[PDB]
Amino acid sequence: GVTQSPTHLIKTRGQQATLRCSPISGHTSVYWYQQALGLQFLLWYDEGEERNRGNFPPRFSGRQFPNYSSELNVNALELEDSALYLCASSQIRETQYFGPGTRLLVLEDLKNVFPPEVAVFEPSEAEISHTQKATLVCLATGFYPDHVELSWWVNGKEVHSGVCTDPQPLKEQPALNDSRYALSSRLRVSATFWQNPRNHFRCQVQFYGLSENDEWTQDRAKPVTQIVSAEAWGRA
Amino acid sequence: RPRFLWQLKFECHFFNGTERVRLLERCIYNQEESVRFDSDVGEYRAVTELGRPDAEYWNSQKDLLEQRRAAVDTYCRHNYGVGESFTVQRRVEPKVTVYPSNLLVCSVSGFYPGSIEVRWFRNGQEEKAGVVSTGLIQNGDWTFQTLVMLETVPRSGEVYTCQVEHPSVTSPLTVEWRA
Amino acid sequence: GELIGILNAAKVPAD
Amino acid sequence: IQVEQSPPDLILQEGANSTLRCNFSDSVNNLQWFHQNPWGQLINLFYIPSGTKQNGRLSATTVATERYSLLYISSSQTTDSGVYFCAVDRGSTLGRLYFGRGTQLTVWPDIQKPDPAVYQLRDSVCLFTDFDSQTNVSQYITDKCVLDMRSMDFKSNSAVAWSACANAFNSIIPEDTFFPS
Amino acid sequence: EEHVIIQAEFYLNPDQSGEFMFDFDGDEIFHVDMAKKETVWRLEEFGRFASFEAQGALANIAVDKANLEIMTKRSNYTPITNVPPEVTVLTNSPVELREPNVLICFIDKFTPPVVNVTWLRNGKPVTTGVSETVFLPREDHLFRKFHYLPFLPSTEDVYDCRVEHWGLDEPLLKHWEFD
Ligand code: NA
Ligand code: NA
C-alpha cells in the first residue's frame, strides 16, 4: 500500500512542514492532493520529475526521489493550509491508490493545545441481568485538537468486534471558535465474559500533540504526543 | 552514426461525422509498425515479433484496455466536436484562372477543403477526353491547389469553360476563355 | 476556447 | 472541470438499496468511485469509463456520451457508511483527478428485537442502548452509533450522556424504555 | 472514410529530438514547442476556438523516449534505414511578374525526421521571409515537410531548394524559374 508520514502535524502560523510519501512498489507516479473544509490537486511526479502542478502558490513545493518516494514541503504556513494532505500512486491514467494522509493543523499559537483525560466506566448490574451483555464506556475529555485515536484492548490484544466509537467528537463548549473536545466509545461483551476476574480491559487514546522541539510558552505540562489510558479488571 | 526512431500515433477515423468511429493506436520502431490497439478488435495485437511483449503486457493491464475501449467516445468523438468549426466546416473559395500553357490550363488554387470537381467545356459541351491533371496538391497551410489541362487546338470564335464545383460555393464557378 | 483531449503514451514493459 | 454529486447525504436502513449519482461537464478519460472512511482512508470501488461493472453488492454504470455515472448499493450494510466520491480523469488533462463534493452515507442496523433501556455506570455516565434505528438523539450527550458483535450476529445502537439519567434522555425515547435505579 | 484526426509523436536518438502534433486530414492543427513548453497553432485563429494543455505532451514525450530506449535494446540496436526524400518545388498560385508569390518546397517520403534545407536565389542563400512546418506523419510511417519562401517573380532569377538528408549521396537541388 501507499504510505505517508507523518500521520498528524501541528504547526504555528509562519512555520514550515515536510510531508513524506511512498508509492506502491511498481508505481512510478506520485500525486499530492489537499482535502480541506472534496480533494484538490497539488502536484504530479513521474520518474523523479514534476510533470504537473495545481493552483497553489510557490510556498507549496515538492520533489520525488530516485526510489520514487516523495516529499511535499509547505513554507509560510497559513490557517487556511489546515487540511488532510493525501498521497496517491498509479500507472498514468489508471486507478489511483491513496495513502492514509497527513492531518495538518495550522494554529495562531499552541496555547490551546491539551491532551485528553481518559476514564473507564464498568457495566451496570442492571444491564447484565437484563440482556446478558456488558457495555464498558470510555470517555476522553478535554483534548485539543481533535487529533486522537481510540482503541480497546482485552488481555493485551487490540479489539474491533463489539466496539463503537463516536463518528466524530463533540465540543465541551459548543458556542466557541476554539473549544476543547470530548469523545466516547463503548465495548460490548457477553455477561459471562465480563464476569471473570482474569480478564483485562483497557481503553486507550493516542493523542497527537506537540513534538519535543515545539516552543512551549506556558506554565502547565507540555502537551506532547502521548498515550492516556484507563483500565478495569472484570468483576465477578 | 546510427539513428533509432520511435513513433506513437493515435488515429481517429470518422465515417459520416461521428456515427461510425474507429480508433487506431500504433507504435512504430524505425519505420516498422510493431504493435497496435484497434478499437475494432478491442485489445492490443502484435504486428511484428518485436512488438509481441508489448501486446502481452498491455493486454494484462485491465484499466488501460477499459480506458482505450471508451476512447472512441471520450477522445475521438470529443476532439471531433472541439474541432468541428474550424476543421470539418472550414471553407475557403478556390481562385480560378485559365491560361494557355496547344493546351488550356485551368488553375484552381487556395481552396479548402480537398473535395473538388473540375470540368472543361468546348462550346457549352463536355470534354472528358483530353483532360490532364496534376491531382490534388496539399499546400501544407490548410489550402489545396490543382491544375487541370485540356489538349485542344483553339479555333478562334470558340468558347472554353473551366467549371469548378466545391463545398465553398452553392452554385459552381465558371471561368471562360474565348477567341 | 474548449480543450483538446489527449491519450496517454503507454509504458512498454521494463527490463 | 465541474463534477456534481447527488444526493449530498443519505441515511439508510441496513438492507435498503440506493443509487448515488455523479454528473460531469466534460469528456472524461476514466471515472473512478471512492469510499472514504472516517479516519480518511480512500478506497477505490470502480475504475469505470463506460459500461456496467459489478463487484458483489456494488455495481456501477458510466454513460460516457451522456456524462453521468450511477453507483448502486444493493442490500446496504453498516460498513458501507462513509463518504462516496466520483472522481474524474478529464480527457484533456493528464495526471489529475477532479473530485465531486461527495455523498455522505449513513447506514443504521435493522434492530429486529428492540430492547430500549437506559443504564447508569460507575468508574457519571448514562447509557441509552438497544433502541431501534428510527430513534433520534438530542444534543453532555453523544449521538447514536452502531456496534457489531460480529461473531454472534448481533448489532446494537447506543448513546452516552454525562454531567441523574432520567433527565438526560427528554428526547423522544421509546414509549417503553427500560429504566432501573 | 470521411475524416482522420491523428495525435502523432516521435522521438529520435541520439539527436534527442521530440515532436508532438495533431493532424487533421494531413494538415497540422498544432504542435508543441518542447523548449518553450507551449502550444503553437498552425493557424493563429485556431487558438480562438481551441486550447491544448502542453504539459500533457511533455509527459508523453518522456514516456516515448523511455520506450525508444528499451525498444533499441530489444532490437539489438538495429538502426533505422535512411529513406531519401522526394522533392518538388512549386508556387502558391500562378506566377505573374511583379505580383507577390510564395515558393513551396515539398519534401516527402523520407525517414529519420532530420533534414537541412536552404533556399538559394541565383546560387546564393536567401533567408528573408522564410518559414517551415514541423515534420508531418505519413501512413507508411515516413514524413512530409514544407518550406516556404515569399518572392517577387522576375525574369532573371533562378531558385533552388537544397535538401540535405543522409539517404542521399549529394545534396538534392531543385530548380525553379519563371518561364
Ligand atoms: Na463565371
Ligand atoms: Na492575377
E56/D contact by beta carbon, under 8 A? yes
Q: Exposed (0-12), middle (13-18) or buried (19+): which is B2, by Cβ within 10 Å? A: exposed
Same domain, A2 and A99: yes
Q: Identify the residue whose cell numbers are 456515427.
A: B19
The string of DSSP codes covering D11-28 is EEETT--EEEEEEESS-E
- The answer for residues whose C-beta is within 8 angstroms of residue D7's C-beta and 6 or more apart is D20, D21, D103
Distances (CA, A) of A102 to A18, A138, A151: 10, 26, 20
Same domain, B76 and B152: no
Chain centre to alpha carbon of residue B74: 24
Same domain, B154 and B175: yes
Give yes or no for a contact between B21 and B14, defined as CB atoms under 8 angstroms apart: yes
Q: How far is the CA of B113 from the centre of ligand 1 (A)?
A: 21
Give yes or no for a contact between D29 and A90, defined as CB atoms under 8 angstroms apart: no
Look up the domain containing A171 and give its range. 109-236
Give the count of domains, chain B: 2
C-beta atoms of C5 and B74 within 8 A:
yes
Give yes or no for a contact between E61 and C5, defined as CB atoms under 8 angstroms apart: no
In angstroms and rounded to an integer, the radius of gyration of the C-alpha atoms of chain B is 24
E95/A contact by beta carbon, under 8 A? no
> Where does residue D77 fall: left (phi above 0), alpha (psi -120 to 50 degrees), or beta otherwise?
beta
Q: How far is the CA of E92 from the centre of ligand 2 (A)?
A: 12
- The answer for residues whose C-beta is within 8 angstroms of residue D69's C-beta and 6 or more apart is D21, D22, D24, D31, D33, D48, D60, D61, D62, D63, D86
Same domain, A126 and A210: yes
Whether the link from the prior residue into E112 is cis, omega within 30° of 0, is yes
Q: Is B58 annotated as a binding residue?
A: yes
- Strands B160-165, E116-121: parallel, antiparallel or unpaired by DSSP? unpaired
Give the 3-state secondary structure of residue D143.
coil
Task: Spell out a b/e string for D94-116, using b for 16 or more CB atoms within 10 Å of the CB, else e.
Answer: bbbbbbbebbbbebbbebeebbb
Choose which CATH entry (3.60.15.10, 3.10.320.10, 3.10.310.10, 3.30.365.10) describes domain E1-79.
3.10.320.10
Size of interface A-C (CB pairs under 8 A): 4
**Of A136, A114, A222, A128, residue with least CA distance to A184:** A136
Give yes or no for a contact between A216 and A159, defined as CB atoms under 8 angstroms apart: no
Which contiguous run of DSSP H or E holds residue D168? Answer: helix D165-168
DSSP 8-state assignment for residue B113: S
**Of B4, B106, B170, A88, residue with least CA distance to D97:** A88
In angstroms and rounded to an integer, the radius of gyration of the C-alpha atoms of chain D is 21
Give the 3-state secondary structure of residue A54.
coil
Give the 3-state secondary structure of residue D64.
coil
**Of A172, A193, A143, A118, residue with least CA distance to D123:** A118
Nearest CB to A100: which of D41, D127, D181?
Answer: D41
The string of DSSP codes covering B37-78 is EETTT-SEEESSGGGHHHHHHHHT-HHHHHHHHTHIIIIIIH
- Give the torsion sign (CA, B151, B153, B156, B158): negative
Distances (CA, A) of A231 to A114, A125, A200: 21, 19, 7
Q: How far is the C-alpha of D110 from the C-alpha of E161, rounded, in Å?
A: 85
**Chain C CB contacts of A68 below 8 Å:** none
Please report how many Cα atoms fall inside a 13 Å half-sphere around the Cα of residue D47, on the Cβ side. 19
- The ligand placed nearest to the CA atom of residue E153 is 2
Partners of B104 in the β-ladder: B100, B150
**Of A191, A199, A189, A129, residue with least CA distance to D150:** A189
Q: How far is the CA of B107 from the centre of ligand 1 (A)?
A: 14
**Of B58, B57, B77, residue with least CA distance to B66:** B58
| E-contacting chains (≥3 CB pairs under 8 Å) | A, B, C, D
- Show me where chain E is broken: residue before each gap, C-N > 2.5 A: none
- Strands A117-121, A133-143: parallel, antiparallel or unpaired by DSSP? antiparallel
| A-contacting chains (≥3 CB pairs under 8 Å) | B, C, D, E
Distances (CA, A) of E27 to B6, B62, E3, E111, E127: 21, 34, 11, 19, 24
Chain centre to alpha carbon of residue E73: 29
Among D24, D28, D29, the strongest candidate for a mutation testing the B interface, having the largest count of B CBs within 10 A, is D29
Nearest CB to D147: which of A95, A100, A162?
Answer: A162
Identity of residue B164: V
**Of D16, D34, D14, D132, residue with least CA distance to D77:** D14
Q: Treating both helix axes as pointing N-terminal to C-terminal, what angle do B62-69 and B52-59 enclose, rounded to 10 degrees?
A: 90
- The ligand placed nearest to the CA atom of residue B107 is 2
Look up the domain containing B65 and give its range. 1-89
Same domain, B69 and B121: no
**Of D95, C6, D30, C5, residue with least CA distance to B67:** D30
Quote the cell numbers at residue D3. Answer: 463534477
Architecture of the domain made up of D1-109: Sandwich (2.60)
Helices (H), A47-194: 125-131, 191-194
Q: How far is the C-alpha of A81 from the C-alpha of A150, rounded, in Å?
A: 26
Of A66, A93, A108, the residue that ends a domain is: A108
C-beta atoms of B64 and A95 within 8 A:
no
Q: How far is the C-alpha of E170 from the C-alpha of A81, rounded, in Å?
A: 65
Q: How far is the CA of E94 from the centre of ligand 2 (A)?
A: 8
Looking up residue B1, the CATH number of its domain turns out to be: 3.10.320.10
Same domain, A232 and A128: yes
Give yes or no for a contact between C3 and D92, defined as CB atoms under 8 angstroms apart: yes
Give yes or no for a contact between E135 and E147, defined as CB atoms under 8 angstroms apart: no
What are all long-range contacts of B174-177, with beta carbons under 8 Å and residues at least 24 apart? B175/B96, B175/B97, B175/B98, B175/B106, B176/B98, B177/B98, B177/B99, B177/B100, B177/B104
Other beta carbons within 10 angstroms of residue A212's beta carbon come to 7
- The answer for residues whose C-beta is within 8 angstroms of residue D64's C-beta and 6 or more apart is B70, B73, B74, D27, D28, D49, D50
Give the 3-state secondary structure of residue B163.
strand
C-beta atoms of E67 and C6 within 8 A:
no
* Phi, psi values for residue E105, rounded to 5°: -100, 115
Q: How far is the CA of B153 from the centre of ligand 1 (A)?
A: 23
C-beta atoms of D40 and A35 within 8 A:
yes
- The ligand placed nearest to the CA atom of residue B173 is 1
Instruction: State the greatest distance between any 2 C-alpha atoms of chain B, in Å, as a whole number.
Output: 76
Q: How far is the CA of B148 from the centre of ligand 1 (A)?
A: 17
Q: Exposed (0-12), middle (13-18) or buried (19+): which is B173, by Cβ within 10 Å? A: middle
**Chain D CB contacts of B61 below 8 Å:** none
Among C3, C4, C8, C11, the strongest candidate for a mutation testing the D interface, having the largest count of D CBs within 10 A, is C3
Looking up residue A231, the CATH number of its domain turns out to be: 2.60.40.10
- Strands A8-12, A102-107: parallel, antiparallel or unpaired by DSSP? parallel
Give yes or no for a contact between B64 and C11, defined as CB atoms under 8 angstroms apart: no
Q: Identify the residue whose cell numbers are 447506514.
A: D107
Quote the cell numbers at residue B44. Answer: 492490443
C-beta atoms of C4 and B53 within 8 A:
no
Give yes or no for a contact between A82 and A105, defined as CB atoms under 8 angstroms apart: yes
Strand order in the sheet with E116-121: E124-126, E116-121, E158-164, E172-177
Q: How far is the C-alpha of B71 from the C-alpha of D28, rounded, in Å?
A: 9
Q: How far is the C-alpha of B85 from the C-alpha of B73, rounded, in Å?
A: 19
Strand order in the sheet with A148-154: A157-159, A148-154, A200-207, A226-233
Please report how many Cα atoms fall inside a 13 Å half-sphere around the Cα of residue B113, on the Cβ side. 14
- Give the torsion sign (CA, B77, B81, B82, B85): positive
Q: How far is the C-alpha of B77 from the C-alpha of A5, rounded, in Å?
A: 43
| C-contacting chains (≥3 CB pairs under 8 Å) | A, B, D, E
Q: Identify the residue whose cell numbers are 536552404.
A: E118
Other beta carbons within 10 angstroms of residue D44's beta carbon come to 16
CA quadruple A170, A173, A175, A179: dihedral, nearest 10 = -80
In angstroms and rounded to an integer, the radius of gyration of the C-alpha atoms of chain C is 13
- The answer for residues whose C-beta is within 8 angstroms of residue E179's C-beta and 6 or more apart is none
Same domain, A104 and A116: no
| B-contacting chains (≥3 CB pairs under 8 Å) | A, C, D, E
Q: Identify the residue whose cell numbers are 472541439.
A: B82
Q: How far is the C-alpha of A70 from the C-alpha of C1, rounded, in Å?
A: 35
The string of DSSP codes covering B68-96 is HHTHIIIIIIHHHHHHGGGTTT--B--EE
Q: Residues for chain C: how many in total? A: 15
Nearest CB to D119: which of A124, A163, A170?
Answer: A124
Quote the cell numbers at residue A200. Answer: 483485562
**Of A97, A173, E83, E40, residue with least CA distance to D34:** A97
Give the 3-state secondary structure of residue A28.
coil
Q: Is B54 annotated as a binding residue?
A: yes
Instruction: Tell me the CATH number for domain D110-178.
Output: 2.60.40.10
Superfamily covering domain E80-179: Immunoglobulins (2.60.40.10)
Chain centre to alpha carbon of residue A70: 21
Same domain, B34 and B71: yes
DSSP 8-state assignment for residue B142: S
- Domain extent listing, chain D: 1-109, 110-178
Chain centre to alpha carbon of residue B84: 16
Q: According to the entry, how was the structure determined?
A: X-ray
Q: Is B73 annotated as a binding residue?
A: no
The chain C residue lying nearest D29, using CA atoms, is C7
Q: Identify the residue whose cell numbers are 492543427.
A: E29
Identity of residue D106: T
**Of A181, A175, A173, A170, residue with least CA distance to A141:** A181
C-beta atoms of A47 and E55 within 8 A:
no
Q: Identify the residue whose cell numbers are 520525488.
A: A64
DSSP 8-state assignment for residue B112: B
Give yes or no for a contact between A128 and A191, defined as CB atoms under 8 angstroms apart: yes
**Chain C CB contacts of B4 below 8 Å:** none
Among B25, B37, B60, B63, the strongest candidate for a mutation testing the A interface, having the largest count of A CBs within 10 A, is B63
Chain centre to alpha carbon of residue A172: 19
Q: How far is the C-alpha of A94 from the C-alpha of B66, rounded, in Å?
A: 10
Distances (CA, A) of B15 to B77, B167, E140: 11, 18, 21
Of B56, B89, B122, the residue that ends a domain is: B89
Whether the link from the prior residue into E79 is cis, omega within 30° of 0, is no
Q: Identify the residue whose cell numbers are 484538490.
A: A40
Give yes or no for a contact between B98 and B160, defined as CB atoms under 8 angstroms apart: yes
Give yes or no for a contact between D77 and D94, defined as CB atoms under 8 angstroms apart: no
Q: How far is the CA of E174 from the centre of ligand 2 (A)?
A: 26
Q: Residues for chain E: how many in total? A: 179
Q: How far is the C-alpha of B109 from the C-alpha of B90, rounded, in Å?
A: 16
- The ligand placed nearest to the CA atom of residue E93 is 2
Same domain, B47 and B119: no
Q: How far is the CA of E105 from the centre of ligand 1 (A)?
A: 32
- The answer for residues whose C-beta is within 8 angstroms of residue D157's C-beta and 6 or more apart is D108, D109, D111, D129, D130, D131, D132, D133, D135, D144, D145, D146
Measured in angstroms, the CA of C10 and the nearest CA of chain A are apart by 8
Q: How far is the CA of B163 from the centre of ligand 1 (A)?
A: 9
Of B64, B89, B114, the residue that ends a domain is: B89
Give yes or no for a contact between A143 and A116, defined as CB atoms under 8 angstroms apart: yes
Measured in angstroms, the CA of A45 and the nearest CA of chain B are apart by 20
Same domain, B59 and B117: no
- The answer for residues whose C-beta is within 8 angstroms of residue D153's C-beta and 6 or more apart is none
Strand order in the sheet with A60-64: A3-5, A17-22, A70-74, A60-64
Q: Is B155 annotated as a binding residue?
A: no
**Of D85, D64, D78, residue with least CA distance to D20:** D85
C-beta atoms of E70 and C12 within 8 A:
yes
- Please give the resolution of this entry in Å, rounded to 1 decimal: 2.6
Same domain, B122 and B166: yes
* Ranges in chain E annotated CATH 3.10.320.10: 1-79
Written in H, E and C, the secondary structure of D66-126 is: CCEEEEEECCCCHHHCEEEEEEEEECCCCCCCEECCCEEEEEECCCCCCCCEEEECECCCE
Q: How far is the C-alpha of B11 from the C-alpha of A64, rounded, in Å?
A: 34
Please report how many Cα atoms fall inside a 13 Å half-sphere around the Cα of residue D32, on the Cβ side. 25
Written in H, E and C, the secondary structure of chain E is: CCEEEEEEEEEEECCCEEEEEEEECCEEEEEEECCCCEEEECCCCHHHHEECCHHHHHHHHHHHHHHHHHHHHHCCCCCCCCECCEEEEEECCCCCCCCCEEEEEEEEEEECCCCEEEEEECCEEECCCCEECCCEECCCCCEEEEEEEEECCCCCCEEEEEEECCCCCCCEEEEEECC
Measured in angstroms, the CA of E48 and the nearest CA of chain C are apart by 6
